[PDB]
Design an enzyme around this catalytic site. Structure first.
Site, short mmCIF file in Angstrom:
data_model
loop_
_atom_site.label_atom_id
_atom_site.label_comp_id
_atom_site.label_asym_id
_atom_site.label_seq_id
_atom_site.Cartn_x
_atom_site.Cartn_y
_atom_site.Cartn_z
N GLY A 191 0.82 -1.21 0.00
CA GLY A 191 0.00 0.00 0.00
C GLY A 191 0.85 1.25 0.00
N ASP A 196 -1.68 8.39 15.31
CA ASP A 196 -2.50 7.90 14.21
C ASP A 196 -3.04 6.50 14.51
OD1 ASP A 196 -3.89 8.18 11.82
OD2 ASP A 196 -2.13 7.80 10.56
#
Ligand SMILES: CN1CCCN(c2cncc(-c3cccc(/C=C/C(=O)O)c3)n2)CC1
Length: 274
Positions: free
Chosen positions: A13, A135
């Site tokens: 990704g 995050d």
């Protein structure tokens, strides 16, 4: 270094974080992840205990490195003229929590409890090592499917943990707390707890509770799936508008919904087919 060492596989990704590839260490056939980050995109830089300029992400990964399997291990890194290359641990088989939830929908509470507990332990490990992740979310959580063990990944938005105010943020907006949205000011742990509340809601409901700034600021939680009273209570506590009204990590793990967690392996046997 670097080609004589690793065999690069397919892209896993790419995004705000860079580009992550599957790879194998040539010397022992070890599964690894190869993460590339453009130097132009790195806004904060740190210094290693030996005095060298590296991205903060490298600093933070080295601070959390240990035998504890709850946080991804940095195995090596390289500097290139225009980028940094991070060699990371790779569980095999693995699936991230976003894909897991996309596939399976809302998780049974027993499974959510096990997963969420493990995330709590991982985040507590980070904080104890002086690191703030910034995050926490489904995509940044890997499931080691054989062992039922969760791994926090992507420290590219993180910072040294401090007790004073943060006025900067570059994690995920829909996991960010109302005080960031309204004031551009947050404290580490209480913002972390906010995002944990979003995560937990996401696990048990199959999607996140808020999409727009107005919704985050309002903080009104609606349960779109059948969720137990105890779980709803915990989620609503993590998502208290006032940062100081949020539970500490200790209060989260002492919460009635968090009692009698499955072990990782029991979790795998029951819920992961293993
Ligand atoms: C955030 N993610 C977006 C979704 C696809 N993606 C994936 C998917 N599967 C495994 C890994 C994968 C495997 C092993 C280590 C890592 C670590 C990444 C990191 O620390 O940034 C990632 N990464 C890239 C990062």
């Amino acid at each position: 270094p670097l080609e004589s060492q690793y065999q690069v596989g397919p892209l896993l990704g790419s995004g705000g974080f860079g580009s992550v590839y599957s790879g194998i260490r040539v010397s022992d056939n070890l599964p690894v992840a190869i993460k590339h980050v453009e130097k132009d995109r790195i806004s904060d830089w740190g210094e290693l205990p030996n005095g060298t300029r590296v991205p903060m992400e490298v600093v933070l990964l080295k601070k959390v490195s240990s035998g504890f399997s709850g946080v991804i291990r940095l195995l090596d890194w390289f500097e290139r003229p225009d980028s940094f290359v991070l060699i990371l641990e790779r569980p095999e088989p693995v699936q991230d929590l976003f894909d897991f939830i996309t596939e399976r929908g809302a998780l049974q509470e027993e499974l959510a409890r096990s997963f969420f507990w493990q995330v709590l332990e991982a985040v507590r490990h980070c904080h104890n090592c002086g690191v703030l992740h910034r995050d926490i979310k489904d995509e940044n959580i890997l499931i080691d499917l054989n062992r039922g063990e969760l791994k926090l990944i992507d420290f590219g938005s993180g910072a040294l943990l401090k007790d004073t105010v943060y006025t900067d943020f570059d994690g995920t907006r829909v996991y960010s707390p109302p005080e960031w949205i309204r004031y551009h000011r947050y404290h580490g742990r209480s913002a972390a707890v906010w995002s944990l509340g979003i995560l937990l809601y996401d696990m048990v409901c199959g999607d996140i509770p808020f999409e727009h700034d107005e919704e985050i600021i309002r903080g009104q939680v609606f349960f779109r799936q059948r969720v137990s009273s105890e779980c709803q209570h915990l989620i609503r506590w993590c998502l208290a508008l006032r940062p100081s009204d949020r539970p500490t990590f200790e209060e989260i793990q002492n919460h009635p919904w968090m009692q009698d967690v499955l072990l990782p392996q029991e979790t795998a046997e029951i819920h992961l087919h293993s």
